[PDB]
Amino acid sequence: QDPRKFFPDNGFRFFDGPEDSFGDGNIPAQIILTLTRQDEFILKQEPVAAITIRTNEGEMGVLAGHEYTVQQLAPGILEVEYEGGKKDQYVISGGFAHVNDTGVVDINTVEAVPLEEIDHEKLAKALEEARAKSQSPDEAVRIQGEIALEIFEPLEAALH
Amino acid sequence: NVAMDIVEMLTKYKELQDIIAVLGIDELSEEDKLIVDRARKVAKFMSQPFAVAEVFTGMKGYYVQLEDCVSDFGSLLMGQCDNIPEMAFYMVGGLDSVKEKAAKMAAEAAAMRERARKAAEAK
Amino acid sequence: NVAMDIVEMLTKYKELQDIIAVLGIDELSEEDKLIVDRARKVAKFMSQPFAVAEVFTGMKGYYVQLEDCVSDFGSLLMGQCDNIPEMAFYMVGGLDSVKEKAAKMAAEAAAMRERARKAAEAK
Amino acid sequence: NVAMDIVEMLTKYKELQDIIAVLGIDELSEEDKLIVDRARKVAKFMSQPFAVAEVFTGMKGYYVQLEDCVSDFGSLLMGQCDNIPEMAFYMVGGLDSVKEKAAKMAAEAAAMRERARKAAEAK
Amino acid sequence: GGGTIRFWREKLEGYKKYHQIVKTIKMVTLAKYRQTVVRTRVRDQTLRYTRKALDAKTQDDQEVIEKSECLLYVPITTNRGSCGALNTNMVRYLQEVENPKMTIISVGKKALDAMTKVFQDTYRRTILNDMKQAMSFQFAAYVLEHMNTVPWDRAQIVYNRYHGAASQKLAIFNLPKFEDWKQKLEEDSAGDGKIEEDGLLQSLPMKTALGELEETAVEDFYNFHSCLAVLNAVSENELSEYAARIVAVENQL
Amino acid sequence: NKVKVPGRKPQDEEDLTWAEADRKLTPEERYARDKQMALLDKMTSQVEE
Amino acid sequence: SWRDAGISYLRYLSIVTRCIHEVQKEGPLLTKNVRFSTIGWKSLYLDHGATKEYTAIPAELEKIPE
Amino acid sequence: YDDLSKQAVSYRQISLLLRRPPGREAYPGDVFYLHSRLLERSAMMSPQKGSGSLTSLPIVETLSNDVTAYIVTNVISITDGQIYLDAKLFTGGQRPAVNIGLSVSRVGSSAQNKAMKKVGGALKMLMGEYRKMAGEQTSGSQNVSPVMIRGARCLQLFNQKGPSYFMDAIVALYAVTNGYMDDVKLQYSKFYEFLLLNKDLPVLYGQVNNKYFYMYNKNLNYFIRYFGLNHEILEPELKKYIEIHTNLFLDNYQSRMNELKSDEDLVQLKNLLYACKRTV
Amino acid sequence: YDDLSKQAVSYRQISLLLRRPPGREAYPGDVFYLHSRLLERSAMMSPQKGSGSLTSLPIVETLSNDVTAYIVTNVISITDGQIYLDAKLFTGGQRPAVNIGLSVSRVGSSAQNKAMKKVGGALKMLMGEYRKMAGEQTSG
């Protein structure tokens, strides 16, 4: 028998993660954002002035040199603000935001769609369905309607 | 019985050659590729050097005895020798010579690996 | 029209043995599998036991009238009999005998199933 | 030497045309796309008109000498004539004539630009 | 002599029909590959904090076997053949690594007939995605829900990495266990930041901030990143299948 | 432990195949038998129902 | 809420994703995204010679493993 | 008649040396009339002529399994049936190497006997069903159909070297078609038959309830040959012999066989199975 | 002519019975010249000759779609085009069961009318691509 003909590579090594820094003494002027849905990015290390995330504890706002914090993303909207003053809103389905002191943001999600790709007419129909599903006494339907309403209520609040 | 089983194995190998030449060995069932590796070992083992062909084969000629020929083919038939590579059976006589050739080849392959390590370190 | 449609189906049947031999049945459309099964039923259905072939078949012959010979092939041509199995068409006459043979084969299949149940009950 | 280099270029262009239909032109390296453009220019340059058909198709014919063709293909192989587009080489004879066609094409494009710009500016 | 020439003519027609059929397979696979190559521009960015969380120094096997009780190896195989040596090399790696404490939950039909004839008892089952609808985060959730049937101490997700159209190599994700990952997180959050392996990144601030994170959220962090790892593996093997099939079809032609 | 290859010898597994039968038509026969068994089982249920 | 009902975080994410896929407009992006929520996969395991489904972990999201 | 192709080479020599014109493949042309005159003398004579008969079993060599040569076609046109022997099956292990797809008989049931008619009517159907499946590598090892089992066991029984008595064949094929030899594996299909024909297990193990049916007498053949096994008197005794034979086999011999792991005992058993293929 | 293959068999009989020297497939050598004596009489005559014309549609039966035979190879060598029918298409409802890839008319458009040239050029550019597309697409 051949002595270990195979020697597979570790796939983690094919990615390039940031290296965290202690005591660097320099504050970044603008963050380096990286948003990813299921596998594909929509933004790769873009310069960004500011960003605004939603969580279960509440809505947070991140700027350059924000403290290292890792935390959930509650299912809602996500605002990016470039140096030019414009903005870009994205609806998400959960995730984890990884902030850096050096100025790097990895918002890894399961979905990321702009609000422009959503219509209020189609949303209004789903609302009463999720609501009446929450009314039906049954654990299989109540939780599903609760989750659907949880994602829809911020949309109904933001489109207005 | 050993001869009839060898002939049956080679018959199946001939039928499988029609697929191997077209698609590849990977598209065969595990049983079929084992049968292929075994029949390839049998065919390679059937070759042996002769004293007359020393000019060509570049090897001393062997005189494989009848009694030792059956035990070798039977061991190759019962799966008693599958860890040996295929090229060890090429141009040899007797399973003892096959094991000697396998030892030589393993030693040479290892030595090539340590040589490549030394070259890479010096590189 | 029925004859020409059957002849048009069997050519595609040839073109699809050309493919199923390589790919498999999975890589064809359901509209294609439908005509495959229909042609596979037609080919077996156009078999016929003869009275002269009692020695070889061991089964009495059938005299199939031309009018019934068109109603049955057309019913099979337009999917009117697709629930019926394939082998029920093998070596019979008209369509009535086909349904008889299907009922038979279902009876013996249920017999084997319940006998397997009773064999598991016994041991 | 020039002919063998052109044959090598065309063989490579065939190998790469067996890739562009697979992947796409961007998949190739910066060297390969250069020889792709040069081979397309060569193939268009082989297209030669004929004085025989001058009455039928209207275009003139060109009797190109031997050494001049060698200098032309060597310039096209050395890359010292690459700024010239591909379509200029189509149906011409000699490097001293494709330049006339290229000047005509550039002047015609400049005339279309002058026409369109003034037509849009007048309104 | 008429039978011989008729036989050769029939074999000629058979080879021609076989050729155009294989050509059709090549066209279909080309369409799928030209779709999936759009991922190649966009990959290599989502797993970087997952690396930072789950990655560890190269641990030798023979210590991992003695440390552990029931490992797990998830080979991601294909649904249909004419791929090449991907499935065979996966099986070869696992029978190279075969040890008394293993368990194999695979992904694909070709892991069903092969492994069961090589690995009798360790092989358990497989998972099948009929690729009419592209893979999803919930497909990897299904795979995690299947892996979690075991109280596994380490999960080696094997897959094929698409380095190029002529390069589809092997790759592994060595996932720890949750309780062990948490304990290592604490033990590495206490001490200072010192890398013990070249190419590895320091993540002490992350391993503190996760300590700031509550328990259920840390379990969700683990499961989410393991799901992303599984998903990247499935996507890379999909692309590697569709890329190696072209090579293993042009050689057939 | 490696593989239970079939063969003529008792330690080996059953070789139910026949060299006379062709392999070209095998997939069509497999599909036909599967479809026929499904139809027969459905007829069993339909007769009881 | 859904936490003690037994369904995991990831099924919750997938359900929210399915909802986002429902509401969004008709377009190429919806054509790309419906693929990332639809359920087509299975499990299977080999018997002595035959296939069998392992239906203990369902694909449909409303259900709960056991 | 041993090789008639040689009988035709001699006629070709005689003709061409006598300055007769050649023909297809150099033969004079009237080489068909030769074999016609020879083989049409085979007949089953009328009772007016004594009810006599003579069978003819001509032998013809074949080159690369071609049936396109002139003499082979000329003779197949004459002879009723043919027994095609294929090198691929001879070399493929099985002996005699008959190919049923290419070998036929244009007499059929009328030639064979009452007891053999029913068995052949079953075996033809079983082989027609088994030809369609046998190309499949057995994957449903427990989900295999009965036909895939019985056909393989029958092919094992077809392996011979010498002839077989009628009584020593109908019983062996009956056990296959009726499925009594379905639990034992394929390799032991002939050792079973050897015990079924030369080592009576129920008479040995004391399970003797049958009044008469035992495979030691050799004279029961003339009752099977007249009444048939599908009769009121031989069928139940046949079943109450074969079932106990299968039970005693599966208990004592099959169990001991599968317990072998040593290479020496395994080879001893292997040689025994081949010997049973030969003698039976 | 329905058909010239049988004319060739008749010539072969006449020759062999009269002990003319044989040749390929027991045909004499000048059997080609026979069909050339015939088919060359077909012609579009000059305006000095009344502008008459004689067209020919010689039929030749193939066997197992053989075209390498002697009479077929001769008539193809003679004719100003050819038509090739196929049984696989005749059974598949395509009647006439032509094979456009093998069917050829060296008189491509000079025979066609003013209204027909445009339509035929369009149909050629359509069928040449339909063949490439249908040959590579699946059955499904």
Residue numbers in the entry:
A (entry chain H): 17 to 176
B (entry chain D), C (entry chain E), D (entry chain F): 379 to 501
E (entry chain G): 3 to 255
F (entry chain N): 20 to 68
G (entry chain I): 2 to 67
H (entry chain A): 283 to 562
I (entry chain B): 283 to 422
Lines quoted from the article behind this entry:
The translocation of protons through the membrane-bound Fo part, mediated by subunit a, drives the rotation of a membrane-embedded c-ring and the attached central stalk, which together form the rotor. The torque of the rotor against the stator subunits induces conformational changes in the (αβ)3 headpiece, thereby triggering catalysis. To reveal how the mitochondrial ATP synthase is modulated by lipids and organised into a dimer shaping discoid cristae in Euglenozoan mitochondria, we determined the structure of the ATP synthase dimer from E. gracilis.
The E. gracilis F1/cring maps of rotational states 1 and 2 showed strong density for IF1, but weak density in rotational state 3. Subsequent focused classification of the IF1 binding site suggested complete inhibitor binding for rotational states 1 and 2, whereas rotational state 3 displayed a mixed occupancy, with a minority (34%) of particles containing IF1 and a majority (66%) not containing the inhibitor. Unlike the bovine ATP synthase, which displays a nearly equal particle distribution among the three rotational states, rotational state-3 (20%) is less populated than rotational states 1 (44%) and 2 (36%). Rather than reflecting dwell times during rotary catalysis, the distribution of rotational states is likely dictated by accessibility of the respective catalytic interfaces to IF1 binding, which for rotational state-3 may be sterically hindered by the proximity to the peripheral stalk. In all three rotational states, IF1 is bound to the βDP-αDP interface adopting a similar conformation. The position of the lumenal H5EG1 on the c-ring β-barrel remains largely unchanged in all three rotational states, suggesting a mechanism of transient rotor-stator interaction during c-ring rotation.
